[PDB]
Design a protein around this ligand. Structure first.
Ligand SMILES: OC[C@H]1O[C@H](O[C@H]2[C@H](O)[C@@H](O)[C@@H](O)O[C@@H]2CO)[C@H](O)[C@@H](O)[C@@H]1O
Length: 370
């Protein structure tokens, strides 16, 4: 199951698992408790299965969106931070990790997609999406692509879809409407249609995924990429002169990236809940622990106020927060998994041409409602 006396931690590969392992080494040096940090592939899907079995990580790291479904399943132990620690973290991050009136994960960092552009290839990033086709034509003349970003994951395409009116679920009266879904509305169709026109006009390739986009940007092949702060470390190693900026507007409206608070959830099956709480509150959710994770891969804005006051000074973090303000914090509700699956199918099918934009978004609407 979950072995006692040890912390097993699941965090995504793009995130700073090596820095988190450094925090775990500090935790071991102080407490005698080994912390093993693992980055299983598809961990957001894997943790529900193993946690339902009672196996799994002691601590699960993901964006909050997935923790509401976990808590509904009962996978997450209700975290019990005292009011002082909640004061240390930002209230909106706490709201992101609140599910059914209970805090079900520890917020670590706020992550929003930003437009990352190569300043040498692109001295000024386009302010609008509509500029990108002409910019791509000019760059293709130069042997370069204007924009390469992950098209397999709905999370990267979502800002374009949301910009003109697309939404996952209607939020009103402090309650998301699971029945009311905005992916097949006109604004979402406009965003997906623009993306598919970029693919059809060969400004973008439908097969482009996270690895291809990151490699193209880091090698200098593409002028722009859309990515979270975690990519900044690889761009820094690449030595590409890059800026992090607001996502381009679509139809005069800001791209709304779905805003994810990286969250640490304690497995309800874990016999190490006290050790996990100790690690997260006094080792991770501290300036030094967040610095260790951030140094491996930038976390974005951090839920911890004291570290974020230092982090906000970074222009890249400022762009992340600007894009987070323009975007919507994700709903953490259980329906969000189904929403992400349906939007993934819609974007992939529309990009490939397997389905029209309208057919894909209609199917996505039916599946996000279900
Ligand atoms: O693409 C759907 C996906 O979106 C979000 O996952 C993000 C995550 O928030 C980022 O930190 C980073 O890992 O990129 C991911 C997308 O590849 C949701 O958190 C996730 O549940 C959802 O499936």
């Amino acid at each position: 199951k979950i072995e006692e006396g040890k912390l097993v931690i699941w965090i995504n590969g793009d995130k700073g698992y090596n820095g988190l392992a450094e925090v775990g080494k500090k935790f071991e040096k102080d407490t005698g408790i080994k912390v093993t940090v693992e980055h299983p592939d598809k961990l957001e899907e894997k943790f529900p299965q193993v946690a339902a079995t009672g196996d799994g990580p002691d601590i699960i790291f993901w964006a909050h969106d997935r923790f509401g479904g976990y808590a509904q399943s009962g996978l997450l132990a209700e975290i019990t931070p005292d009011k002082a620690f909640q004061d240390k973290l930002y209230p909106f991050t706490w709201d992101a990790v609140r599910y059914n009136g209970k805090l079900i994960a520890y917020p670590i960092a706020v992550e929003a997609l930003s437009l990352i552009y190569n300043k040498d290839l692109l001295p000024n990033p386009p302010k609008t999406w509509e500029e990108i086709p002409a910019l791509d034509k000019e760059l293709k003349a130069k042997g370069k692509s204007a924009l390469m970003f992950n098209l397999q994951e709905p999370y990267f395409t979502w800002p374009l879809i949301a910009a003109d009116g697309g939404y996952a679920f209607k939020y009103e009266n402090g309650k998301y409407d699971i029945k009311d879904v905005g992916v097949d509305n006109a604004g979402a169709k406009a965003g997906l249609t623009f993306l598919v026109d970029l693919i059809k006009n060969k400004h973008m390739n439908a097969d482009t995924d996270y690895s291809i986009a990151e490699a193209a940007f880091n090698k200098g092949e593409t002028a722009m990429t859309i990515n979270g702060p975690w990519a900044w470390s690889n761009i820094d190693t690449s030595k590409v002169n890059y800026g992090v900026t607001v996502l381009p507007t679509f139809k005069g409206q800001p791209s709304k990236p779905f805003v994810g608070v990286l969250s640490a959830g304690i497995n309800a099956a874990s016999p190490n809940k006290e050790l996990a709480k100790e690690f997260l509150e006094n080792y991770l959710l501290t300036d030094e622990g967040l610095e260790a994770v951030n140094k491996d891969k930038p976390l974005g804005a951090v839920a911890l106020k004291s570290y974020e006051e230092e982090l906000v000074k970074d222009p890249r973090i400022a762009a992340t927060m600007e894009n987070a303000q323009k975007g919507e914090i994700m709903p953490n509700i259980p329906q969000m998994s189904a929403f992400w699956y349906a939007v993934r199918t819609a974007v992939i099918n529309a990009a490939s041409g397997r389905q029209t934009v309208d057919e894909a978004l209609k199917d996505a609407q039916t599946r996000i409602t279900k």
